[PDB]
Amino acid sequence: ENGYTYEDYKNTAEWLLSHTKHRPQVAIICGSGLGGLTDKLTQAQIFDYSEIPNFPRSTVPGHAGRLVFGFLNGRACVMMQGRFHMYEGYPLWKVTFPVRVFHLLGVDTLVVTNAAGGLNPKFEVGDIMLIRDHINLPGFSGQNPLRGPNDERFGDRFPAMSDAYDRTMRQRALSTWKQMGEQRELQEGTYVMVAGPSFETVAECRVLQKLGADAVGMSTVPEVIVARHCGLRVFGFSLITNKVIMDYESLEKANHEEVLAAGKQAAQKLEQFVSILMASIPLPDKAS
Amino acid sequence: ENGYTYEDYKNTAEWLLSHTKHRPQVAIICGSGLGGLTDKLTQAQIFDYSEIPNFPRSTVPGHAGRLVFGFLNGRACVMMQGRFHMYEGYPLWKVTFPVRVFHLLGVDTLVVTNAAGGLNPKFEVGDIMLIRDHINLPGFSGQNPLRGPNDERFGDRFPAMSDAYDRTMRQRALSTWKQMGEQRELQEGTYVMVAGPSFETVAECRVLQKLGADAVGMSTVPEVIVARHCGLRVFGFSLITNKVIMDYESLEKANHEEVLAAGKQAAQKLEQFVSILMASIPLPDKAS
Amino acid sequence: ENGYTYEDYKNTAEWLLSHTKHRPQVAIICGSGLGGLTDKLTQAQIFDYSEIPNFPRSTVPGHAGRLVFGFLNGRACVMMQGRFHMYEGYPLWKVTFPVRVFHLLGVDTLVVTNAAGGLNPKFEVGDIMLIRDHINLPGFSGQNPLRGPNDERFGDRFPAMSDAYDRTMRQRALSTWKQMGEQRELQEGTYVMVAGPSFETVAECRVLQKLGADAVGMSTVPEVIVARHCGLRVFGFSLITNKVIMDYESLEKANHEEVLAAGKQAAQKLEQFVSILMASIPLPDKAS
Numbered sequence: 043e044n045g046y047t048y049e050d051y052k053n054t055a056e057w058l059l060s061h062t063k064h065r066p067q068v069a070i071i072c073g074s075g076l077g078g079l080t081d082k083l084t085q086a087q088i089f090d091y092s093e094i095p096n097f098p099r100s101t102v103p104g105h106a107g108r109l110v111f112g113f114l115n116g117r118a119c120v121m122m123q124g125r126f127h128m129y130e131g132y133p134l135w136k137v138t139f140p141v142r143v144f145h146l147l148g149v150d151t152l153v154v155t156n157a158a159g160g161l162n163p164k165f166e167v168g169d170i171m172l173i174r175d176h177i178n179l180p181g182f183s184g185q186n187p188l189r190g191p192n193d194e195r196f197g198d199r200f201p202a203m204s205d206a207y208d209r210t211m212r213q214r215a216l217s218t219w220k221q222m223g224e225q226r227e228l229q230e231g232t233y234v235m236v237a238g239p240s241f242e243t244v245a246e247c248r249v250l251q252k253l254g255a256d257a258v259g260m261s262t263v264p265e266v267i268v269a270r271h272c273g274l275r276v277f278g279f280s281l282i283t284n285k286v287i288m289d290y291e292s293l294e295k296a297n298h299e300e301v302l303a304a305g306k307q308a309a310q311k312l313e314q315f316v317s318i319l320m321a322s323i324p325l326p327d328k329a330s
Numbered sequence: 331e332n333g334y335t336y337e338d339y340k341n342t343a344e345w346l347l348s349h350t351k352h353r354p355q356v357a358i359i360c361g362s363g364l365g366g367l368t369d370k371l372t373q374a375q376i377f378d379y380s381e382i383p384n385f386p387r388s389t390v391p392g393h394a395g396r397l398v399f400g401f402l403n404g405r406a407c408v409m410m411q412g413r414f415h416m417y418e419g420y421p422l423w424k425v426t427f428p429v430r431v432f433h434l435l436g437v438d439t440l441v442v443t444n445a446a447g448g449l450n451p452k453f454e455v456g457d458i459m460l461i462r463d464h465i466n467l468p469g470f471s472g473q474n475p476l477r478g479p480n481d482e483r484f485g486d487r488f489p490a491m492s493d494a495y496d497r498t499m500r501q502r503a504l505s506t507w508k509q510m511g512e513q514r515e516l517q518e519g520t521y522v523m524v525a526g527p528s529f530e531t532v533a534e535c536r537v538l539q540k541l542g543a544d545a546v547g548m549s550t551v552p553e554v555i556v557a558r559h560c561g562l563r564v565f566g567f568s569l570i571t572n573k574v575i576m577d578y579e580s581l582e583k584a585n586h587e588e589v590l591a592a593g594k595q596a597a598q599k600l601e602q603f604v605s606i607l608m609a610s611i612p613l614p615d616k617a618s
Numbered sequence: 619e620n621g622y623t624y625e626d627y628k629n630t631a632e633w634l635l636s637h638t639k640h641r642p643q644v645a646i647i648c649g650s651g652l653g654g655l656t657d658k659l660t661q662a663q664i665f666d667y668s669e670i671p672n673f674p675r676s677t678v679p680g681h682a683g684r685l686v687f688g689f690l691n692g693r694a695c696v697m698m699q700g701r702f703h704m705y706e707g708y709p710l711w712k713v714t715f716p717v718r719v720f721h722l723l724g725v726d727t728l729v730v731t732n733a734a735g736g737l738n739p740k741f742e743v744g745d746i747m748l749i750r751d752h753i754n755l756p757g758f759s760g761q762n763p764l765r766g767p768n769d770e771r772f773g774d775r776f777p778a779m780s781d782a783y784d785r786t787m788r789q790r791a792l793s794t795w796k797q798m799g800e801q802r803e804l805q806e807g808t809y810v811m812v813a814g815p816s817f818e819t820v821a822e823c824r825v826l827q828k829l830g831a832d833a834v835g836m837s838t839v840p841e842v843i844v845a846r847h848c849g850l851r852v853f854g855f856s857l858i859t860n861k862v863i864m865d866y867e868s869l870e871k872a873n874h875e876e877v878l879a880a881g882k883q884a885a886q887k888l889e890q891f892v893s894i895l896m897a898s899i900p901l902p903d904k905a906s
Contacts, residue, residue: 043419044419101767102767102768128760128765129760129762129764129765129766130766130767131619131620131765131766131767175531175532175533176531176533176534177531177533177534177537178526178531178534179758179759180758180759180760181524181525181526181528182467182468182524182525182526182534182759183467183468183470183471183472183473183525183759183760184416184417184468184471184473184525184526184759185526185759185760186417186525186526186527186528188417188526188527188528189416189417189419189525189526189527190417190418190419191389191390191418191419192390192527199527200527200528200529201527201528201529202528202529202581202584203528203529203530203531203534204529204530204531204532204535204575204581205581206531232533236757236758237757237758237759237760237762237765238754238757238758238760238761238762238764238765239762239764239765239768239775239776239777240757240762240764240776240777240778240779240843240846240847241776241777241778241779241780242779242780243751243752243753243754243779243780243782244751244780245751245752245753245808245830246752246753246754246758246779247780248830249753249829249830252540252828252829252830253537253540254533254536254537254540267528270528271528287780293778293780293781296778331707332707463819463820463821464819464821464822465819465821465822465825466814466819466822469812469813469814469816470755470756470812470813470814470822471755471756471758471759471760471761471813472704472705472756472759472761472813472814473814474705474813474814474815474816476705476814476815476816477704477705477707477813477814477815478705478706478707479677479678479706479707480678480815487815488815488816488817489815489816489817490816490817490869490872491816491817491818491819491822492817492818492819492820492823492863492869493869494819520821540828541825541828542821542824542825542828555816558816559816
């Protein structure tokens, strides 16, 4: 909760509204290599985190990090290309700042994407995992974006997370994947957040396996938590960018961004899939 | 350890001694809905955390948070109605400040209570679990109230916790419950501390189960740790306010305070039980 | 990463170079009771963390903490007697500061030692465990020395840890132990870092067991992580100073430093073993 004040969020939201003709319904957070979704926008309007009032700037990426407003397959959007991570030194109340303002912008849904490691054996690099649940490791210890005094204007003190990833949207995505006639099916599993920049050891990969994680990553969870606090509908996917060596074996899949079509294609498929899913996100106009 | 200085504790203890005629032997920390224990006090003297010198004030509850000195079933007490939690933004050295001063007040025993979720299947809401052990999740990562330079005037650098919950007092409570002729028996199990305001997900509830936790909560453990550091006898109970859905099922037991007699009665029974147990806490006068 | 700046490291390294005629190839970090290794140095030159420019001073130990440059069995060394721990209040970027400067000193290898508790049943106090892997509990939550913006001059953003403990050096130590004709064999297993000054409870010791930890301690891991970031060859051992009671049993092995020959001898054997291993650390001169 800390760091910002309610008026901070209000001021940042008003600046945006007074600077963009766009009134977003959907907010989309792009993971690594997934930033290309911005190219699918019509009537796009770009914003530098930098020029937006209380918006945290990027530590190094910067240009990789910007806010784009536009239209994606029927929905008014605002995509965040280049998300914040706590390993970059960002306290969780900064990492989630966007979501809080997106809420005060009118966004009622948040689709989140992230690149992850494959813990579940059946996954194979290139795969896309529809996120059904999560294990918040940083949270178990105090690293929860909601730590601090709660603001009832945003939500409750003890919000439930057992129902964060929308079942309706999850069944809708499951159907849509079938509808597309996709060869390999849409995977679905538990995501485990782990901070720190460095990569896991076989010993650690095995405890995550034990804990029941299907994919491991260093983001998403905080943003999802505050989104739910605001009452926003939340759903997302994880792009498996490498299988995880859980057995004392020779290293492999070191790089993930420079992997040719292995990345390119897989990222490409998720980005379009997400666009098609815009037709499945309930219009605020109570469409039936 | 950080934040306060030894003289801070001494100054706060002396202020209390010079402001209350009471010389407490027992300190009792009330969990949620368990604050009614204060009504069982004779010759009660109320203090606002606010007016006590270095005492951390409440973020919002405030009035729910106050220090009451009195007499409970034969013992001189000081009950803390409305405890501090780290999810409220309190660093652990503030959350435990009370215990440290209680020590310099003469308190040689600390009974702690907390409301928790039922992880062990056999538990049923309303149940009371005698705490036999704990799993300190925030501590495994650095969140231990003792982090910082150790003060030998309070205790050692590496205090043992494998024996925090008194076996004598635990057998005494086990007997007393029988003595009362209580229908359902006194449950006993491991408590798992988890920070953060939000509630667990099925995925997370399952790892706690795996870890061997019988009840989950967001407090108690830090206070217990510093109490042991001071050498105080420690024992407590957990009031199961809801069973935990560890299987992909529809939500339930959202509310806990507004649950009619479900809360009322169960809280009522624990409060009296604790009073009866005052007769079991060893008098400093080496009674035999 | 935080706290210091690159020039801070450069300035501290230059001060050392301009104050010592020694040009260390190997850096050795001594655990508890293992500080006697300093006595095996020839042409030793002592430094007080205190007098070295940005070097964090000791909270209490102080005199137990000093930097000694000398020669050990063929290698130019710099031993750190009295390491920093996060439970002492040191942020991880201070705990690892040494390693970062050791790198800018020319050190291409780091041998780390620590005293630990025995989780694996087959271990028996006195035993020495060659570290093959680790489980970074503080890291899973944000406590990773690399948190903050990454410096490419030291290393990458996402360094791999699945290969931190050198297999070559691990097989070399395995051979050397045999070569010595040692009675009991060299143990090898996973080390689990746990912060906080206090000791584990049976409940907690059982989760570590479940997690697959063979030894538990409150150090080593951070130093290893930054060493790898710098690209240094890393290897180390853990001296089992007490078996861990993972079953509800009477306490035992409280003390570890005051345990007569139990400590003395075991520490003695590890210290010499480490010296013999100097002959196994690859000379920068591409010896073949």
